[PDB]
């Protein structure tokens, strides 16, 4: 990616619709600002699990995860972003999308699957090896079953950051 300025003054930012930005960790929490449309193509390509490099017009690349975007309520457009500089120990408590695989046999007799938790925040994902999704097979599930966090399988070096008993995806009956 690319970004340039970071003045405390914002009057330049609004005109070219470039998003405001920051990058921080323990040592340096310096603020910045970058182009909008390329940022949105990138944030589409990767969410809170995806990461990208920023090349501030200073000559050194940095590797950033995305941590929070706070944007306009009226206009749908994103307003501000907070990238997070990350050391290659496991990134803290990253969120992972839930996604369902298979045609559940509960769907075939009047039920429908419902993902009660669209994101699951796992600790110690392991940076650069982050889970960009999380497939859960629902075919075993029948109407009224609950696939909790004590089911969802995990890759390397990962441990769920949420209570295992909590409901995740559940098949639901008609009406």
């Amino acid at each position: 990616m690319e970004l340039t300025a970071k003045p405390r003054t914002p009057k330049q930012k609004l005109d070219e619709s470039m998003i405001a930005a920051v990058a921080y960790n323990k040592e340096n929490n310096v603020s910045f600002a970058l182009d909008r449309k390329a940022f949105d193509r990138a944030f589409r390509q990767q969410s809170t699990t995806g990461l990208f490099d920023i090349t501030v017009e200073g000559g050194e690349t940095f590797p950033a995860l995305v941590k929070a975007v706070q944007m306009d309520k009226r206009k749908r457009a994103p307003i501000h972003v907070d990238f997070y500089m990350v050391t290659y120990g496991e990134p803290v408590e990253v969120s992972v999308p839930v996604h369902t695989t298979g045609r559940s046999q509960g769907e075939v007799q009047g039920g429908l699957v419902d993902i009660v938790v669209h994101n699951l925040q796992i600790v110690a994902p392991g940076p650069r090896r982050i889970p960009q999704e999380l497939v859960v097979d629902v075919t075993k599930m029948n109407i009224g079953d609950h696939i909790t966090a004590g089911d969802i399988k995990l890759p390397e070096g990962c441990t769920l950051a949420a209570d295992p008993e909590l409901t995740v995806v559940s098949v639901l009956p008609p009406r």
Binding site: A68, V69, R76
Partner: peptide, 10 residues
């Protein structure tokens, strides 16, 4: 109307 973009607030 909209489909949900990427989201945070949990």
């Amino acid at each position: 109307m909209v489909k949900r973009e990427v989201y945070d607030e949990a």
